[PDB]
Design a protein around this ligand. Structure first.
Ligand SMILES: CC(C)CN(C[C@@H](O)[C@H](Cc1ccccc1)NC(=O)O[C@H]1CO[C@H]2OCC(F)(F)[C@H]21)S(=O)(=O)c1ccc(N)cc1
Ligand SMILES: [Cl-]
Ligand SMILES: [Cl-]
Ligand SMILES: [Cl-]
Ligand SMILES: [Cl-]
Ligand code: NA
Ligand SMILES: [Y+2]
Ligand SMILES: [Y+2]
Lengths: 99, 99
């Protein structure tokens, strides 16, 4: 699709089998979800933004169905206020900004 | 321009006469800069992200030269780790996401 930016750019995804809404976020390097359960080993990490770093777990497998594509991506899991789709995932689906 | 997302989407702007680099950030509701000085009255605020709330001043005049356009927009000033151009400014220049 092509969208304007008058509303927050949410999309519906399925991540590790769970349905979620997440913000298409060109300012996020890294996709992050809260409140999902994923199997297997993880590696610990932190992400930094406006007003603080957060603690996350990293998963490297994890399926992500987004905008009619299925990619395999890195997903960070931790208590973000909204779920975001970052550039790691958006580049896999060929997303572009026009301005 | 049309850009892909393989790198952080920085643009060069002139905000209140000062040259800055800022991230085109579709996950940001409003534009924020650090280390700019702007004239006139302001109003207090906080924004929230990964990690919690950055404290800011809001200015309502403030000229912003971006991508060959000159907007007048709202600008928040506070200690963000990277300057961001949010949807408030991006909508005024007609920016779109393609995915
Ligand atoms: C989280 C999102 C819903 C809100 N934020 C915008 C983001 O685009 C932010 C913009 C941002 C970029 C760079 C530093 C701080 C914030 N990026 C961000 O938090 O990304 C994190 C996840 O991937 C990593 O890549 C950048 C990172 F931060 F490190 C990590 S924000 O910065 O908190 C923000 C909130 C409100 C306004 N008005 C403006 C900005
Ligand atoms: Cl909205
Ligand atoms: Cl929780
Ligand atoms: Cl980069
Ligand atoms: Cl590039
Ligand atoms: Na990904
Ligand atoms: Y939760
Ligand atoms: Y500073």
């Amino acid at each position: 699709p092509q969208i304007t930016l008058w509303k927050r750019p949410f999309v519906t995804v399925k991540v590790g089998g769970q349905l979620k809404e997440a913000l298409l976020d060109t300012g996020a390097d890294n996709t992050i979800f809260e409140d999902i359960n994923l199997p297997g080993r993880w590696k610990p990490k932190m992400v930094g933004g406006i007003g603080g770093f957060l603690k996350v777990r990293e998963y490297d497998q994890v399926p992500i169905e987004i905008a009619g594509h299925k990619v395999i991506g890195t997903v960070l899991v931790g208590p973000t206020p909204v779920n975001v789709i970052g550039r790691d995932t958006m580049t896999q689906i060929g997303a572009t900004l026009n301005f």
